[PDB]
């Protein structure tokens, strides 16, 4: 295999790209009532991954393009000083403020993909 | 009488078959720039809508009537004349924000 | 898919002015814009304007214009779906001329190219 | 945006068909256990919608076209005097007896999809 | 329609393989809490499913070919003497102990689809 759960969690951008599908795994009365209300919270912020991911065309990926062209004002850096130096979890804390704004530009993107693909097949 | 969109004056026709009435001005009211609404309309009473867009027909209007558009007139077709044809069809030259420039009229006889 | 009842038959003499009213029932009065038109003896048919039951939007041909009083109330709602208006129609410089049968007609749709379109017409009003 | 959560409720067909996802975002002890009674409840009628798309070859969409041909019999008018007039509403409570029927007419299509596409890639 | 929910249980692979939507469609206080729970436990399990097929690039699909080639140290039978001869119970039951071995199989043939797919994109 590879180093496992979340084990690129300080690795490089670029090789923590590679096997995704290791952490999509293992994201899915006192005691009773604790245990049953994790079980409940779970299905919940895992549902809410796919609900994005269903209304951005990306419903059964794991790396995912879409059409957003990257606006510079989010960061104006390379290709290279992010895949191959920021680690995940230093890149999101740096598009943090922009995060909930590129959230809207995936929903226009596939809302106007899809009723272009309407009067696609129109024909 | 003023109205700038003549149609064939007046025509006739027998039981079983089928009529065409033209409707044709200049090219401030026709025709490849503005859409084609045709009325039945009996003298001064309840008029009806036919056709509009040039082919569509309103709600539950018979199959029988039918439209076209060519570049300097519109046509109305009646197939199946039946009894109850006997009356006066009016045009009208209109875009989405305009009005309807009628025309002149033209009395259909089914007498057979 | 309802009725458009309108006023009698009034008849003034020329330089008055008469109100033609336009009640509706059976369809939602706010959907639809209300067309005036009318048939004198001397011409053909004339449109003569419609206006806008919820945009309160008016255009009339110019030949109407500063000649035409348009208003509407406001729907009085009886179900969902149904409602019940009124449009009213006046006239400035009245002549002989202007004698004829005048209906309103409520509109075609509610998008499109033929909105307006005067779809569903009214009964009838003799004039001077 | 557009107007907004149900804004296009009483507007026509056309204009609402545009910007759908903005209902697809908000779908998803006395006051402890009537609380979670609706969270649970609320990922259930989501998951019946998602399962309905998924075996209709629709899993992922907002806008799905098919194959089956409309049948008159549901209603015998125009895309004109439904799309740019009837709202939404009016709509479905006109299908609302012939529903449960097409329903079962997209699963058939889905699954006489694949099956052909089995032997598709059977070459 | 056919036989109806689990009717070709004992049905032959190749006939049991058609109208695989009706075990689709149906998989989806002392009372109170052991009926919640059976509520909580149900969307569990089907969404452990979907979660699969989700990491397989199967999302959506009820038929679904992948690349993994067929090893034949997991079964060395004919085509013809599976889907026309053993029935789906009978089947898995000779997989069972190869079904793990197979399912991190389709998980990289999936990781390792879109991560050549991206760089498909790249041009
Ligand atoms: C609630 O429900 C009502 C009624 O159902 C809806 O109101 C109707 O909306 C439809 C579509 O939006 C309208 O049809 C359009 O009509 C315009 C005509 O407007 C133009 O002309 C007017 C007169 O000349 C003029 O007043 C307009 O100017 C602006 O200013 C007014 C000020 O009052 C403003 O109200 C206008 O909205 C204008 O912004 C304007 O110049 C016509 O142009 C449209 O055709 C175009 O668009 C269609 C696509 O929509 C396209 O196919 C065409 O080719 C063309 O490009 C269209 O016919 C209708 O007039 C409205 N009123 C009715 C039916 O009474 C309302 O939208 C609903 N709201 C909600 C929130 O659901
Ligand atoms: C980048 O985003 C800003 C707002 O954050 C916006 O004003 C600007 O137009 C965007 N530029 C591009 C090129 O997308
Ligand atoms: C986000 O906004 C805060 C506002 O206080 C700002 O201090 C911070 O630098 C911003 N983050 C980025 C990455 O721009
Ligand atoms: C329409 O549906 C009816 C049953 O509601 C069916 O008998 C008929 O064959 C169908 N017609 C078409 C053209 O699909
Ligand atoms: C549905 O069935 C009922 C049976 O009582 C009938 O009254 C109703 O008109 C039907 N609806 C449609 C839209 O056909
Ligand atoms: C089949 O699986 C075995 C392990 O079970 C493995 O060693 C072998 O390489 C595989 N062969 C093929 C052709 O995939
Ligand atoms: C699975 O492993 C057990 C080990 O005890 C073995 O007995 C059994 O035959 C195996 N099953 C198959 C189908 O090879």
């Known amino acids: 295999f590879i180093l496992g759960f979340l084990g690129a969690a300080g690795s490089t951008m670029g090789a923590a790209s590679m096997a995704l599908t290791v952490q999509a795994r293992l994201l899915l009365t006192v005691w009773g009532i604790k245990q049953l209300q994790a079980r409940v919270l779970a299905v919940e912020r895992y549902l809410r991954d796919q609900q994005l991911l269903g209304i951005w065309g990306c419903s059964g990926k794991i790396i995912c393009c879409t059409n957003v062209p990257w606006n510079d004002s989010w960061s104006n850096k390379t290709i290279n000083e992010i895949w191959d130096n920021m680690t995940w979890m230093q890149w999101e804390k740096e598009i943090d403020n922009y995060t909930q704004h590129i959230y809207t530009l995936l929903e226009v993107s596939q809302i106007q993909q899809e009723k272009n693909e309407q009067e696609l097949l129109e024909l | 009488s003023q109205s700038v969109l003549t149609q064939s004056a007046s025509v006739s026709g027998s039981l079983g078959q089928s009529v065409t009435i033209s409707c044709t001005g200049p090219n401030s009211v026709c025709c490849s720039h503005k859409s084609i609404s045709w009325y039945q309309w009996p003298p001064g009473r309840a008029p009806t809508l036919i056709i509009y867009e040039d082919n569509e027909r309103a709600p539950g209007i018979s199959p029988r009537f039918s439209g076209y558009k060519s570049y300097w007139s519109a046509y109305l077709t009646i197939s199946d004349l039946r009894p109850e044809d006997e009356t006066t069809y009016y045009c009208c030259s209109y875009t989405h924000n305009s009005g309807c420039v009628f025309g002149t009229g033209t009395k259909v006889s089914v007498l057979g | 898919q309802g009725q458009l009842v309108q006023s009698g038959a009034t008849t003034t003499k020329p330089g008055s002015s008469v109100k033609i009213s336009c009640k509706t029932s059976?369809?939602?009065?706010?959907?639809?814009?209300i067309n005036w038109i009318r048939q004198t003896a001397g011409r053909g048919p004339e449109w003569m304007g419609w206006?806008?039951?919820?945009?309160?939007?008016?255009?009339?041909?110019?030949?109407?214009?500063?000649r035409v009083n348009m208003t509407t109330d406001t729907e009085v709602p009886v179900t969902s779906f149904t409602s019940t208006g009124a449009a009213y129609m006046e006239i400035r410089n009245l002549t002989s001329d202007d004698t004829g049968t005048y209906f309103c007609?409520?509109?075609?749709?509610?998008?499109?190219?033929?909105?307006?379109?005067?779809?569903?017409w009214g009964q009838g009003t003799l004039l001077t | 945006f557009i107007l907004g959560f149900l804004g296009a409720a009483g507007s026509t067909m056309g204009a609402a068909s545009m910007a759908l996802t903005v209902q697809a975002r908000l779908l998803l002890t006395v006051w402890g256990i009537k609380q979670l009674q609706a969270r649970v409840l609320a990922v259930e009628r989501y998951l019946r919608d998602q399962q309905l798309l998924g075996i209709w070859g629709c899993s992922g969409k907002i806008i799905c076209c098919t194959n089956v041909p409309w049948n008159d019999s549901w209603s015998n008018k125009t895309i004109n005097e439904i799309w740019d007039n009837m709202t939404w509403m009016q709509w479905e409570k006109e299908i609302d007896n012939y529903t449960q029927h097409i329903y079962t007419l997209l699963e058939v299509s889905q699954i006489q999809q694949e099956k052909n596409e089995q032997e598709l890639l059977e070459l | 329609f056919i036989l109806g929910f689990l009717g070709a249980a004992g049905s032959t692979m190749g006939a049991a393989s058609m109208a695989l939507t009706v075990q689709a469609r149906l998989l989806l206080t002392v009372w109170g809490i052991k009926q919640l729970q059976a509520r909580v436990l149900a969307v569990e399990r089907y969404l452990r499913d979907q979660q699969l097929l989700g990491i397989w690039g199967c999302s959506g699909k009820i038929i679904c070919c992948t690349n993994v080639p067929w090893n034949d140290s997991w079964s060395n039978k004919t085509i013809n003497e599976i889907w026309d001869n053993m029935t789906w119970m009978q089947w898995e039951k000779e997989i069972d102990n190869y079904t793990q071995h197979i399912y991190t199989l389709l998980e990289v043939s999936q990781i390792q689809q879109e991560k050549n797919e991206q760089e498909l994109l790249e041009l």
């Open positions: 059976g369809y939602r009065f706010n959907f639809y814009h």
């Open positions: 206006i806008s039951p919820y945009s309160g939007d008016k255009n009339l041909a110019p030949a109407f214009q500063d």
């Open positions: 007609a409520k509109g075609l749709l509610r998008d499109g190219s033929s909105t307006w379109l005067p779809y569903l």
